[PDB]
Write a protein that binds this ligand. Structure first.
Ligand SMILES: CC(C)C[C@H](N)C(=O)NS(=O)(=O)OC[C@H]1O[C@@H](n2cnc3c(N)ncnc32)[C@H](O)[C@@H]1O
Ligand SMILES: [Mg+2]
Ligand SMILES: [Zn+2]
Length: 852
């Protein structure tokens, strides 16, 4: 054994040993319990950095722990390869997105190999390959014929100068980002998933997820946004019917989640496009100007809560079906058209938005809810004005005195009796828009035929292959300029037709890739039946909180869709979820990378500390750290600097500390083997061992219990490492030179290197092979010796009134109440008490009990 730790030598040799043994290339082995551990797969956008590395190190730690405990572990890796990264590089470096992507994949794959993650590379997928995306095309066509995928007109941002569709994130202040031209709202046919048909299932199945962070479940619930409410119709007053045609001539319909306050309604508000607004804006140019200002604002919810809420009265009136009140209709800019009825009632006394609107225009406030004895000034708003759980109805006639749910059901009964309303469930969830007017994405498997319509491509003809020899330039979708792509024949009638040239939202690839890893070469379906049955669901998913809503909701949706298609038999894709904290790093600037600065030879300006990312160019390349210190130093530093969920500050001094600890561990094993070579590790009955060696074994086995619980239950790796460090401090303070000393030392060292192998497997593999000839992964996770934890019993003096009357043998863990009990039953005490009770019993732990 070499004296000094050389990671540049031992880390390649350890990786070759694992690769050659194929320990991470797994099959559907029924004779082994499965464990599927998944980290969110990266975009192949150029280089991984230490942030990605923390995520994948967490996943590898968990995989290697399960591997040591006998599991058949699948830890797969792949490339989320479609999307806007490569298209933007295509406009920059004037290169094809495919070539840019495959080159980043090659570079990034070697980044991962050199960190030594226990990954089944035979299961690698790249989502931009036909062998992959043909199956999301297949599922698309199967859902399209069921109506689960459908075609309908939707709104898009059309940039008239750049001649392309823009994402909302690229429309700044009404105009295009890279052009400043005023953006047009256009209606174009697009494709949607009818995810609203699964809202209740997607909401209710969250309850099954007993091992998810409650915050992630809460965010999904809020996104789905189910509400139980009440449709309510207000009769159009007789003087207010001009210009109105149809049912709009008879009533104004709204949805409320507070029908228990319908008696508190003092006006009603309609959207600018509501037929009452347009009818009242007939002879009214100011209503016309308000309606126009509305249509030119941003309906995005981000602007909505941060916008000043305005309105104009319409001179039209409707009637409250409960108390007969005539209420004016207002046009208001916060009421959205297309979101249900496009009209709301307003109860200013019990809804904050309505209170501010009514305080602006001096509209009435009518109290219908009292929360206890609380004071109500119609002038100030109070948090309890909206209290739904502790209020009771006032000024409501028949309904005086009921709580929220009772009044809700009573209003339901009264309104249905009058045909004026009915219960109704709504969701804020909208359908999922698939269409993207972009080149670098999965083609939509639809052919447009003038006689047949929108025809799905037959399964035999899938995939619809995306041509890779394309260099986009942002001048609109290149697929729409390639007749050799879009010109085709109709699959139904054989006539001339045209392919759809839009491509799919790239969230579609990440919505089922975790099933594809189960059989990434299956040619007859998305996932084979045999492998889906074996691997079941993902046991452990690790990714950042930025994907806690859309990505996770989409994946759960696809799982149900695939289950409904008969392809898998789980309801939920991910059993456990770990949301790792962000690695953050100081930035510098024209943004300069930390590895190229020092504190041209000229200085830079040192700016703030933020999430590591290419946006501010503050990603530390792991290859730089590995060349300097080794993969194990990088892994150890990540796992030790912070609990995995807390943010982690990049730190030069943290890297050095990790490296010193690995030199320490190397030194410990070398100095041990220097003093006499490997022996059989201590095992069995420890009677006869010296106190110091018993104490070292107690430390050892309690360290084994605490590490197993930190990896397995707590998933807190920093404290597991800190625990192994304490064992070595105890070790260092123990004279292990005797024959029994060497055997305990061997036991300690054999346990430490296995306990740390999930964190730093290169050094631990190497040290283990110097200690013990067996394969580390067949020796398995260290076991806890319960006897090693039993401390020694102590003898206690039993005094009756201060005079010694006996002795008791008591356990080292014994409480004051056990001592009191054992003392009271001692034959010598019981005799010298003469049936008299105790006035007091003084317990001195470890020394004496004195009965008064
Ligand atoms: C399933 C699919 C939608 C995933 C999608 N392809 C994707 O997001 N790819 S990715 O390359 O941006 O990120 C991959 C993982 O790496 C984490 N990560 C990134 N930066 C940091 C950081 N500074 N600190 C810590 N972790 C970080 C990040 O959260 C994610 O889990
Ligand atoms: Mg359960
Ligand atoms: Zn046809």
């Amino acid at each position: 054994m070499q004296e000094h730790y050389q990671p540049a030598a031992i880390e390649p040799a350890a990786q070759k040993k694992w690769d050659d043994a194929r320990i991470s290339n797994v099959s559907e082995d029924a004779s082994k319990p499965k464990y599927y551990c998944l980290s969110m797969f990266p975009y192949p956008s150029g280089k991984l950095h230490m942030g990605h590395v923390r995520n994948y190190t967490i996943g590898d730690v968990l995989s290697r722990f399960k591997l040591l405990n006998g599991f058949n572990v699948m830890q797969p890796m792949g490339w989320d390869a479609f999307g806007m990264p490569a298209e933007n590089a295509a406009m920059k470096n004037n290169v094809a997105p495919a070539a840019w992507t495959y080159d980043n994949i090659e570079y990034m794959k070697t980044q991962l190999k050199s960190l030594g993650f226990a990954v089944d590379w035979e299961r690698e997928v790249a989502t931009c390959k036909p062998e992959y995306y043909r199956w999301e095309q297949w599922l698309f066509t199967k859902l399209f014929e069921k109506g689960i995928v459908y075609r309908k007109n939707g709104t898009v941002n059309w940039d008239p100068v750049d001649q392309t569709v823009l994402a909302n994130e690229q429309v700044i202040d009404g105009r295009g980002w890279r052009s400043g031209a005023l953006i047009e709202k256009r209606e174009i046919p697009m494709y949607y998933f009818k995810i609203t048909d699964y809202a209740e299932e997607l909401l209710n199945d969250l309850d099954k997820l007993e091992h998810w962070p409650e915050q992630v479940k809460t965010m999904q619930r809020n996104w789905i946004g189910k509400s139980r409410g009440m449709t309510v119709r207000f009769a159009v007053s007789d003087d207010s019917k001009q210009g109105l045609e149809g049912d709009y001539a008879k009533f104004l319909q709204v949805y409320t989640t507070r029908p228990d306050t319908l008696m508190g309604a003092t006006y009603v508000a309609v959207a600018a496009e509501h037929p009452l607004a347009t009818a009242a804006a007939a002879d009214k140019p100011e209503l016309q100007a308000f309606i126009a200002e509305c249509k030119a604002g941003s309906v995005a919810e981000a602007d909505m809560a941060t916008m000043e809420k305005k309105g104009v009265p319409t001179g039209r009136y409707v009637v409250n079906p409960l108390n007969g009140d005539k209420l004016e209709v207002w046009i208001a800019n916060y009421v959205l058209w297309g979101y249900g009825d496009g009209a709301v009632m307003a109860v200013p006394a019990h809804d904050e938005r309505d209170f501010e609107f009514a305080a602006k225009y001096n509209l009435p406030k009518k109290q219908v809810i009292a929360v206890g004895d609380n004071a109500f000034d119609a002038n100030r708003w109070q948090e309890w004005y909206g209290d739904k759980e502790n209020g009771v109805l006032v000024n409501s006639g028949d309904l005086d005195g009921l709580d929220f749910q009772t009044a809700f059901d009573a209003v339901a009964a009264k309104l249905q009796s009058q045909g004026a309303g009915e219960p109704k469930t709504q969701y804020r969830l909208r359908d999922w828009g698939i269409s993207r007017q972009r080149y670098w994405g999965c083609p939509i498997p639809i052919v447009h035929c003038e006689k047949c319509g929108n025809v799905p491509v037959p399964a035999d003809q899938l995939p619809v292959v995306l041509p890779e020899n394309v260099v986009p330039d942002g001048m609109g979708s290149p697929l729409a300029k390639m007749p050799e792509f879009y010109e085709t024949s109709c699959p139904c009638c054989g006539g001339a037709a045209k392919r759809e040239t839009d491509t799919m939202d790239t969230f579609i690839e990440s919505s089922w890739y975790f099933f594809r890893y189960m059989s990434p070469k299956f040619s007859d379906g998305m996932v084979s039946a045999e492998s889906a049955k074996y691997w079941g669901a993902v046991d452990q998913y690790i990714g950042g909180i930025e994907h806690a809503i859309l990505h996770l909701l989409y994946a759960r949706f696809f799982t149900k869709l695939m289950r409904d298609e008969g392809l898998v038999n789980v309801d939920e894709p991910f059993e456990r979820l770990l949301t790792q904290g962000m690695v953050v790093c100081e930035t510098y600037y024209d943004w300069i990378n930390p590895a190229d600065v020092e504190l041209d030879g000229l200085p830079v300006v040192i700016s703030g500390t933020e999430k590591m990312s290419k946006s501010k160019n503050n990603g530390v390349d792991p290859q730089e750290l590995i060349n300097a210190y080794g993969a194990d130093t990088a892994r150890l530093f990540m796992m030790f600097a912070a609990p995995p969920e807390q943010s982690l500050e990049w730190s030069d001094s943290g890297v050095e500390g990790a490296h010193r600890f690995l030199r320490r561990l190397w030194r410990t094993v070398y100095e041990y083997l220097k003093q006499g070579g490997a022996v059989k590790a201590f095992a069995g009955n420890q009677d006869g061992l010296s106190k110091e060696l018993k104490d070292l074994r107690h430390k050892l086995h309690s360290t084994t219990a605490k590490v197993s619980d930190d990896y397995g239950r707590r998933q807190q790796f920093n404290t597991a490492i800190a625990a192994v460090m304490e064992l070595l401090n105890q070790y260092d303070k123990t004279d292990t030179g005797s024959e029994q000393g060497r055997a305990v030392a061997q036991e300690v060292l054999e346990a430490a290197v296995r306990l740390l192998w999930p964190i730093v497997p290169h050094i631990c593999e190497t040290l283990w092979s110097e200690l013990n000839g067996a394969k580390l992964w067949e020796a398995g996770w260290p076991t806890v010796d319960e006897a090693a934890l039993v401390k020694s019993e102590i003898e206690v003096m039993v005094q009756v009134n201060g005079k010694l009357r006996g002795k008791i043998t008591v356990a080292a863990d014994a409480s004051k109440a056990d001592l009191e009990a054992a003392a009271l039953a001692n034959e010598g005490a019981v005799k010298f008490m003469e049936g008299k009770p105790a006035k007091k019993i003084i317990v001195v732990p470890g020394r004496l009990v004195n009965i008064v």
